[PDB]
Amino acid sequence: LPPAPRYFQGENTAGFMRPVRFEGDITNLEVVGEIPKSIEGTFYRVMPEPHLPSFIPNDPWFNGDGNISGFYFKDGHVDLKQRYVRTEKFVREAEARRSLLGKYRNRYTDLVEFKIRSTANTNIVYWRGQLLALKEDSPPYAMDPETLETFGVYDFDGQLPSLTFTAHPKFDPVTREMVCFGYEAKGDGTRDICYYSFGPDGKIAETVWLVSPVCGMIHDFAVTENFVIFPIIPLVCDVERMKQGGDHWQWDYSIPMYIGVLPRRGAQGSDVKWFEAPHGFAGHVANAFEDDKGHIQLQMAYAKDEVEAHFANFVLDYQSDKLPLAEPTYLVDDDMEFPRIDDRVATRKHKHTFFCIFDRKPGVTDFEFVMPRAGGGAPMSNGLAHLNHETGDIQRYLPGPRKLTGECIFIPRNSEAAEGDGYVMVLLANYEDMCSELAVLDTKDLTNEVALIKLPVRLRPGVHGNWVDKSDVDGHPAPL
């Protein structure tokens, strides 16, 4: 076997990116200010954090084993629980005490044969009394919301029709359905997309097989009352390249940003229309909804070719036979990503969005101090913004010149709160202290920290996270 290094080396594991690899508990986290006493629930977030040094030099950040953080809030107190997902990779590498899984999404570089290659390191969502730890090349891993014990790879009682499960399922607040898909749904380099949904009784509802015009990355999707929408990133998979030891993904300058529209209920695969947005990068979906003309308003981060994407509105008409789309309109000027809405209006008209920004205004980030301490290979964000879509008012939270942010969560103030009224939480990297902090903001004034929770350790830059409110028996908020 290629030798297993006994310590981490290279930019992906330097400074703030150095793996900690802790599993366990820190109760009674230190707090500056006051956590509102009525907040009750858990903030779950996932970070890639390699458990063992990779035998692959400069293994990318996005290949790291999924480590789940839960912040448990009650009566103005907060406790941390942290545990690795017991993926096949994690379990087999822990038993061997060395790395065995190879390059990102290239099984031809693995030192042993894996059934499931998931690092479960992209998203952590709640479904019917379990957490689902998500990686778009794999089924979910089911976990206990209270103990963070791993139950195992989850196939929804043998109903899962796809080899793959998106990191970005949508929760319909009216129907209580989890709306899902997988791309490369029949394995490496396949153009198969499987669209499927689960009702609140846990039974599969939709299953539709459709065909992508290229084997492209479909990272995120959008759901409206009557449609599901598949934006394709121009990253394209060739299995022949992989068999020679090459990358799963390669950028294709020549192709549009395809946006597939499929009827949400009772469709065949041939019903998909592959609209052609101008060449660019499909970032995260904020939300999509049908307007009173029945046209789809798709709001998502969009880049051409630190966060360098813009908050785009695409207008889609399923009835239109013209496949080429106009350039989108832009809702704000900011370099942005990681958009969140009040999920009580998901798949319907939203008028509040919260997102990460990278403000390049001189002085906002002390780059001279931060860059030599930051390591490499994770998105950077130096603030949050709140857009009111009705008034056009924007509030910006800037944590400080020596701090960066992850993706935020939104918490309704209570079950009677107006859309976008409540609290925002976001994990900060404090490069001064080389510690993580959890900031609690009131949506009445996003510029002010109501509480700053001071972790005694670093949490590596992570990916997605979700709020599970104690008032919601099914873990998801009630519709507005």
Partner whose binding site includes residue 7, from Cl ion, a second copy, none (CB under 5 to 8 Å by kind) = a second copy
Nearer to a second copy, 125 or 148 (CB): 148
CA gap 22, 37 in Å, rounded: 29
Give all strands of the β-sheet with 216-217 in edge-to-edge order: 216-217, 233-237, 249-251
Among residues 20, 91, 255, 480, the one that binds a second copy under rule CB under 8 A: 20
C-beta of 95 vs 393, nearer to a second copy = 95
The yes or no reply on residue 312 touching a second copy (CB under 8 A) is no
Pick one of 207, 367, 457, 471: the residue that binds a second copy (CB under 8 A): 457
Task: Return the amino acid letter for 469.
Answer: D
> Is 57 an interacting residue with respect to a second copy (CB under 8 A)?
no
DSSP E strands in 103-247: the ranges are: 123-127, 130-134, 141-143, 150-153, 170-171, 178-183, 192-198, 204-211, 216-217, 222-223, 227-231, 233-237
Q: Is 21 in the site for a second copy (CB under 8 A)?
A: yes
d(CA 46, CA 191): 28
The residue (of 19 and 173) whose beta carbon lies closer to a second copy is 19
E strands within 105-191?
Answer: 123-127, 130-134, 141-143, 150-153, 170-171, 178-183
Tokens of residue 451, six digits: 């509480």
Question: What is the x/- site pattern for a second copy, positions 418-447, by CB under 8 A?
Answer: ----------------x-------------
Q: Which of residues 150-179 bind Cl ion (CB under 5 A)?
A: 150
- Provide the minimum distance between the beta carbon of 67 and a second copy in the complex, in angstroms, as a whole number: 12
Q: Is residue 48 involved in binding a second copy (CB under 8 A)?
A: no
In terms of Cα–Cα distance, which of 288, 289, 328 is closest to 311?
328
* DSSP per-residue letters across 255-286: S-EEEEEEESSS--GGG-EEEEE-S-EEEEEE
Q: Choose which of 63, 67, 69, 82 interacts with a second copy (CB under 8 A).
A: 82
Among 12, 16, 17, 19, binds a second copy (CB under 8 A): 19
Q: What is the DSSP string of 386-412?
A: EEETTT--EEEE---TTEEE---EEEE
Q: Determine the interface stretch with a second copy among 5-13, 105-113, 240-248, 279-287 (rule: CB under 8 A).
A: 5-13
If one asks whether residue 144 binds Cl ion (CB under 5 A), the answer comes out as: no
Annotate each residue in 142-181 with x if it binds a second copy (CB under 8 A) or - if it does not, as one string: ----------------------------------------
Strands 403-405 and 204-211: unpaired
Pairing relationship of beta strands 403-405 and 422-430 according to DSSP bridges: antiparallel
Residue 235 CB-half CA count within 13 A: 12
92 is a contact residue toward a second copy (CB under 8 A): no
Q: How many C-beta atoms lie closer than 10 Å to residue 480's C-beta?
A: 14
Give the range of 228-236, 250-258, 330-338, 453-461 binding a second copy by CB under 8 A: 453-461
Binding of residue 24 to a second copy (CB under 8 A): yes
Residue in 425, 427, 413 with CA at minimum distance from that of residue 477: 413
Instruction: Note whether 149 binds Cl ion by CB under 5 A.
Output: yes
Residue 271 binds which of Cl ion, a second copy, none (CB < 5-8 A, kind-dependent): none
Q: Does 456 bind a second copy (CB under 8 A)?
A: yes
The two three-digit tokens of residue 367, written as one number: 């780059």
* Strand-pair category, 170-171 with 150-153: unpaired
| Window contacting a second copy (CB under 8 A); options: 19-27, 332-340, 437-445, 470-478 | 19-27
Among 18, 191, 241, 373, binds a second copy (CB under 8 A): 18
In the set 3, 95, 97, 113, which binds a second copy (CB under 8 A)?
97
The dihedral formed by the CA atoms of 262, 267, 269 and 271, expressed in degrees to the nearest 10: -60
The b-or-e profile of 45-84 (16+ CB within 10 A means b, else e) is: bbbbbbbbbbbbeebebbbbbbbbbbbbbeeeebebbbbb
**Judged by CB under 8 A, does residue 58 bind a second copy?**
no
Name the one range near a second copy by CB under 8 A: 46-54, 56-64, 118-126, 390-398: 46-54
Q: Does 25 bind a second copy (CB under 8 A)?
A: yes
User: Residue 81 interacts with Cl ion (CB under 5 A)?
Assistant: no
Q: Which residues bind Cl ion (CB under 5 A)?
A: 86, 149-150
Q: Which residues bind a second copy (CB under 8 A)?
A: 6-8, 18-28, 30-32, 51-53, 77, 82, 94, 97, 434, 454, 456-457
